[model samples]
Target: KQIVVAGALISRGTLLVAQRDRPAELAGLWELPGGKVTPGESDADALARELREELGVDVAVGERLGADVALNDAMTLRAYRVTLRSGSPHPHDHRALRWVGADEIDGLAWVPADRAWVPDLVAALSGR
Candidate 1:
């Protein structure tokens, strides 16, 4: 099965979230910024690449945040906790970027795939 990796980038008690702009079905919904992992690519590598390409930021991919989520029978979604290594994130491919704190994380409209991690995200943000 193919893997779709996302990053839960936290800094100063906030989680970075991106808004989708295309594929009408998912437009305007928020998600942990990332994309599909290529064949033979490591999860961390794919995450770093996706972040650079989509968010224009360099990040240090850290530990896994939550359980692997099955996006479909052929692909899975996994999120990693990450830290910004350099560059402020700008929405290169997404519609916008927002740094959400624990109190605000649950209020945004998240994509279905990322909704599963809300609790874990709240916990991480609360811990920070």
Candidate 2:
């Protein structure tokens, strides 16, 4: 079991959401963008790797965006708050990338894996 990674990547008054799931595809399921943590990687390193491949962007690092999520029997999910360091996110493997706000978070067809992260994202998006 390894630590999973996710980015609560927020910028421009919104949190970045990505398109996923084929079955949910027709349903348009959007979820937090990230992946599994690999060897020699913790937070920032894992964040950098996942974003680089997943969204083609570079991020600064971490500051816990939300609480931890323990899963099935193999791992845990850790989401971090990330800010832009360079390239803007554009989808490669996904259908589209979106910036959703506090008011709109609940409206998206987010996967249950992210159900707990939503409130924290809402708070961040509704910031000062």
Candidate 3:
């Protein structure tokens, strides 16, 4: 099985979320920004590279935020907390990007695999 990672880049009481633009089925659905762990790459390194590639930002990967989710028999999705260390986040690979507050996070149309993290995300944003 392969592991996929996503980042919950929270800043100023908001979480950075991206809307997918490709892979037709995932298009328009929101998710935390990150990608698959390539062979020989650390999860953190893969996440950092993914964020730089997808969001045009440099981020310092932090602790894991929530439980790992099964995307399928062959893939899993995990999320980590992150801090933006440099560069502004521009949606280079997504349909759009938004910084959503705790109250609004649950309302977004999230990708099915990521919807499982809603409670965890809300708790993090709420400082619980």
Candidate 4:
């Protein structure tokens, strides 16, 4: 089975982050704020839906940063740059939403699943 997952690079000022504790799979993890793509749904659609559901905000999914292919047997994760549309991120499902800068991300304890992609995620957001 192939699983599709999407995350966003949500930034405000010099901070960039994704909501954690918002969803079980990503709890305590620093992700880009996206979710699994349901059958018949596009990755971009999933991106929008997840943000709305998890963050209470609407977003526009932008250019693809790239895909993390073969990250696991059952899933393929894709990430994109995203622009905020409306609303603030409500921490309904998160322990707390954190605003992290590029440097801070590298040292923080992140969700194990997302650790492997940290370099790629940071580089993309930092334009490095």
lDDT of 1: 0.92
lDDT of each: 0.92, 0.82, 0.93, 0.67
Worst 10-residue stretch by lDDT in candidate 2? 20-29
Query: Model 1 clash pairs?
Result: none
Q: Candidate 3 residues 1-128, lDDT tens each?
A: 79999999999889999999989999999999888999999999999999999888899988998899988999988999999999999999899999999899889999998988999999999999
Instruction: List runs of model 1 lying over 4 Å from the truth.
Output: none
lDDT tens readout by residue for model 2, 47-106: 888889988899987688788888767898888888888898998767788988789997
Worst 10 residues of 4 by lDDT: 7-16
TM-score of each: 0.97, 0.89, 0.96, 0.78
RMSD of each: 1.0, 2.1, 0.8, 2.8
Best by lDDT: 3
The order of the candidates by lDDT, greatest first, is 3, 1, 2, 4
How well does candidate 2 score on lDDT at residue 98? 90
Q: Please identify which of the two predictions, 1 or 4, would achieve the higher TM-score against the true structure.
A: 1
For candidate 4, lDDT tens digit of each residue in 1-128? 45555555456524346547645775676655566788888778888888788779888888876556565777676767787778887665556667776677788666666677667666765777
* Deviation (Å) of 69 in candidate 2: 1.2
Worst 10 residues of 3 by lDDT: 62-71
What global local distance difference test value does model 3 have? 0.93
| RMSD score of candidate 4 (Å) | 2.8
